[PDB]
């Protein structure tokens, strides 16, 4: 279990028919199809019958599986090669640091490549390496407030931890800066609510059936995707040398 900041900060756009069209002006519009995170919830019939007195274990297992699905959605929206944010950045929007460690000069270059940068995402180990560079230069950044929470910030831009961002064996990671919202032509999240059997908005549970053994099976499905409206809404600092 982790703090899924990406799901909390991304706005969500309603999609009809499971498909979304974005006009590209460098040709043909790019089409986004919703992806699915599915799991089968298996419960023995004895548990569903007898173990409901202190707490309904059928609902307890349902919440446990839903949390696992949310963790997988967070992982896919960053690392997926089709629609992940680490692979859908324009080549002009990818920059490298002057030296190994992530210095305050590198952060200023990252936020100067687009208008109205709204959030920074980095691995918790990367955030620790950023703080060490601050201390060596004797600067103490103030901080910001986001969604009722107090978080760290740089030039007023909140910096949020995310453990889904990979760390290479050679102790390198990446930092992500993005603009948000459809009205700002930023990054948006794609989902479709109103599906027939909604346990949660955009999430469905179906009875499926019972097999030869007294095991009840359920199908849990969540549909999601992500899109970048304009190329200059996302930026990556590629090779940040953490660990020294």
Author numbering: 44 to 69, 254 to 471
Source paper text:
In contrast, Sl‐Enc2 formed characteristic ca. 28 nm shells, consistent with other T = 1 Family 2B encapsulins. That is to say, the Sl‐Enc1 majority sample yielded a symmetry‐averaged Sl‐Enc1 shell map while the Sl‐Enc2 majority sample resulted in a symmetry‐averaged Sl‐Enc2 shell density. Therefore, we used the symmetry‐averaged Sl‐Enc2 map to build a model for a complete homogeneous Sl‐Enc2 shell. The two‐fold pores are large and elongated with dimensions of 14 by 60 Å and partially occluded by the CBDs. The absence of any resolvable N‐arms in the homogeneous Sl‐Enc2 shell contributes to the large dimensions of these pores. Two additional types of pores are present in the Sl‐Enc2 shell at the five‐ and three‐fold axes of symmetry with diameters of 6 and 3 Å, respectively. Symmetrical Sl‐Enc2 or mixed interactions never exhibited resolved N‐arms in our 3D classes.
Encapsulins are a prevalent protein‐based compartmentalization strategy in prokaryotes. Family 2, the most abundant class of encapsulins, is further subdivided into Family 2A and Family 2B based on the absence or presence, respectively, of a putative cyclic nucleotide binding domain (CBD) inserted into the E‐loop of the HK97 fold encapsulin shell protein. Through heterologous expression and purification studies, we show the differential assembly behavior of the two shell components – Sl‐Enc1 and Sl‐Enc2 – and demonstrate their ability to co‐assemble into mixed shells with variable shell composition.
